[PDB]
Ligand binder design. Structure first.
Ligand SMILES: *[C@@H]1O[C@H](CO)[C@@H](O[C@@H]2O[C@H](CO)[C@@H](O[C@@H]3O[C@H](CO[C@H]4O[C@H](CO)[C@@H](O)[C@H](O)[C@@H]4O)[C@@H](O)[C@H](O[C@H]4O[C@H](CO[C@@H]5O[C@H](CO)[C@@H](O)[C@H](O)[C@@H]5O)[C@@H](O)[C@H](O)[C@@H]4O)[C@@H]3O)[C@H](O)[C@H]2NC(C)=O)[C@H](O)[C@H]1NC(C)=O
Ligand SMILES: *[C@@H]1O[C@H](CO)[C@@H](O)[C@H](O)[C@H]1NC(C)=O
Ligand SMILES: *[C@@H]1O[C@H](CO)[C@@H](O)[C@H](O)[C@H]1NC(C)=O
Ligand SMILES: [Zn+2]
Length: 596
């Protein structure tokens, strides 16, 4: 009708206004996140409250248009997105209380300090970097357990009453948008009613490999720590796995690697010896993208980013993140960067977000996000997969005197699995837990043990000490304290293998029927063929449902476990044999580390 013509002009104008108002909210959030004070908290929450109020006016104005009657799929999609208010649907007082609750949790988490194990006078150890360094480096099980407990008590238990209020307010918000719970609100971002089932099916296919890796790691840990510390048949004590949440185990690769007489890629020491800085690491990431004929970082990036931990003793959120300011070319990273191999991957991870932001900044505001949350998280990881290859690391002079025999290949495959397969059950449990609270499936009296129950069922790990319903451990993970959906990372770790396989084929770097070009040594550095595929997909933003974005990249429309399995198939074959040959116990008894 004539109405659809006016509507298109309504949208064009409203999109620009939302960008500009979001800009101002993002600036205040940035200011808080990079400098936590009471004054910046109030500024952030007051701006948010005002944007919330305007969003409600907008939702209500969508009803004045017959938008579901229109011809244009594109107009209807944009209107649909403006009806989805999220937390902004709350009454203004409930919204302000929710923001205050979220602030309390995120700043509790960011301000955690603990006492040194060897010196209880020295009480200024932060997660990043001091506690993370001990967890990743110490092989003293008693020190490890000490830091685990100190951290979980302060980051987790201390915000129980706040976490509860947040679940209530999150649930109320979802119901006001006519979702059953916050779980359905999160899942709506994947635009697919069978999405949970799809992930269950993929997870069930990779679980057997996970159990083989688990079994082997447990066997190797028993030889290091002995049977008093690690049982044969029980869940692995999580504090021994190189990471505070046992989400990835690559930091203990030096004690669990298949062939310890053969090389294991660890380039941290060479980075340090070649004088690498944070600045250099970001410049390398930048080079990687521009090498593929993708977009160079703008000057605002270099001028406004924070790529090193401030040295002025202020409080900030050190958890690494990427920020879109919704103008032109104002994109930033906040990373407390350290010169290590894992941090090099993180740098590429974060720069994948930046690239996505630049690729879609010509889109209308509602379309300036990922095709789905998982797509956003995968982009940088596709590059990190290349960066991590011995091929790439020899090219940039970080890996010296490396012979890629069959045993070094198994070592590298295993190292990657400790980051990529191990994480899958972990990532699944973070949202399974929250979903189950959001949906009202667990009584408040059982919330802590329901967490550790899932961590046992899916990952076969447990706490180093007995916990109970007096503790509350979930918020000790950043994203749980900060209310960041975690499924995006599960989706990412599956789909990034679909992107990488396809990028590798396009780059001439992978042929199944040619042993010179195996998937696990593919480097896509310099490939404009791969870059083109990325451009086609990333530039779409959220303008189409995600199957359409994937189709733009490689012609497929389906999320699949095929690629991640193909990548690790040589590992699976070897590891199955090695477990049988060493009579390794697979599976685990129920944990008894959480008392009701
Ligand atoms: C979540 O789900 C909620 C339901 O569970 C839903 O809430 C409902 O939304 C309806 C509109 O979205 C709303 O409808 C209005 O009802 C008015 C009368 O209802 C009152 O009495 C109820 C008991 O009987 C009370 O419980 C309520 O609290 C109400 O106070 C009507 O006056 C009103 O009507 C007018 O509006 C229609 C709209 O027509 C549409 O648009 C054009 C009009 O420009 C039409 O040409 C077109 O065909 C189309 O129909 C007009 O026909 C005309 O002006 C009417 O007079 C309207 O029906 C309903 O009251 C409300 N609550 C409940 C519980 O029913 C939420 O909307 C959902 N939330 C989200 C985010 O989607
Ligand atoms: C942190 O924020 C305060 C406002 O609460 C401001 O005055 C101060 O300059 C900021 N500090 C830094 C280092 O930016
Ligand atoms: C970069 O992009 C151009 C135009 O968009 C494309 O045609 C070309 O393949 C790319 N250039 C290089 C360096 O390969
Ligand atoms: Zn990310």
């Amino acid at each position: 009708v004539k109405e659809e013509i006016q509507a298109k002009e309504y949208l064009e104008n409203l999109n620009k206004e939302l960008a500009k108002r979001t800009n101002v909210e993002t600036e205040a959030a940035w200011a808080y996140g990079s400098n936590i004070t009471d004054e910046n908290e109030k500024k952030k929450n007051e701006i948010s409250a005002e944007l919330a109020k305007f969003m409600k006016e907008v939702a209500s104005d969508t009803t004045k248009f017959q938008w579901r009657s229109y011809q244009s799929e594109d107009l209807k999609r944009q209107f649909k997105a403006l009806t989805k208010l999220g937390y902004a649907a709350l009454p203004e007082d409930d919204y302000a209380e929710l923001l205050d609750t979220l602030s309390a949790m995120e700043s509790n988490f960011a301000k955690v300090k603990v006492c040194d194990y060897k010196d209880s006078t020295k009480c200024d150890l932060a997660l990043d970097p001091e506690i993370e360094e001990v967890i990743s480096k110490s092989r003293d099980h008693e020190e490890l357990a000490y830091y685990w407990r100190e951290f979980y008590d302060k980051a987790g238990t201390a915000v129980r009453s706040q976490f509860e209020r947040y679940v209530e307010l999150n649930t109320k918000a979802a119901k006001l948008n006519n979702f059953t719970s916050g779980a359905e609100a999160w899942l709506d971002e994947y635009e697919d009613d069978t999405f949970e089932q799809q992930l269950e099916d993929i997870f069930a296919d990779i679980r057997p490999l996970y159990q083989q890796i688990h079994g082997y790691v447990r066997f190797r840990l028993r030889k290091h720590y002995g049977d008093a510390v690690v049982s044969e048949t029980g869940p692995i004590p999580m504090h021994l796995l190189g990471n505070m949440w046992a989400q990835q185990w690559s930091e203990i690769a030096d004690i669990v690697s298949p062939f310890p007489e053969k090389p294991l890629v660890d380039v941290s020491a060479e980075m340090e010896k070649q004088g690498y800085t944070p600045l250099k690491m970001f410049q390398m990431g930048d080079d990687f993208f521009t090498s593929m004929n993708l977009t160079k970082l703008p000057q605002d990036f270099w001028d406004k980013s924070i790529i090193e931990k401030p040295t002025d003793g202020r409080d900030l959120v050190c958890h690494a993140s990427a920020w879109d300011f919704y103008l032109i070319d104002d994109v930033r990273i906040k990373q407390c960067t350290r010169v290590t191999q894992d941090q090099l991957f993180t740098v590429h991870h974060e720069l994948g977000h930046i690239q996505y932001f630049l690729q879609y900044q010509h889109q209308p505001f509602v379309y300036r996000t990922g095709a789905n949350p998982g797509f956003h998280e995968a982009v940088g990881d596709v590059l990190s997969l290349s960066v991590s290859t011995p091929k790439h690391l020899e090219k940039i002079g970080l890996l010296k005197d490396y012979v890629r025999d069959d045993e070094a290949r198994i070592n590298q495959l295993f190292l990657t699995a400790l980051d990529k397969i191990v994480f899958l059950p972990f990532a699944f449990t973070m949202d399974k837990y929250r979903w189950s609270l959001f949906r009202g499936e667990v009584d408040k009296a059982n919330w802590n043990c329901a967490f550790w129950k899932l961590r046992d069922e899916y990952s076969g790990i447990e706490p180093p000490v007995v916990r109970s319903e007096k503790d509350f451990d979930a918020p000790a993970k950043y994203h749980i304290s900060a209310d960041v959906e975690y499924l995006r990372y599960l989706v990412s770790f599956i789909i990034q293998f679909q992107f990488y396989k396809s990028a590798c084929i396009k780059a001439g770097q992978y042929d199944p029927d040619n042993v010179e070009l195996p998937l696990d040594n593919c480097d896509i550095y310099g490939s404009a063929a791969a870059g083109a595929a990325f451009h086609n997909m990333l530039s779409m933003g959220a303008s189409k449902p995600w199957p359409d974005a994937l189709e733009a990249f490689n012609g497929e429309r389906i999320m699949s476990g095929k690629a991640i399995a193909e990548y690790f198939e040589p590992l699976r074959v070897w590891l199955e044999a090695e477990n049988i040959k060493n009579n390794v116990h697979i599976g685990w008894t129920t944990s008894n580390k959480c008392v009701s």
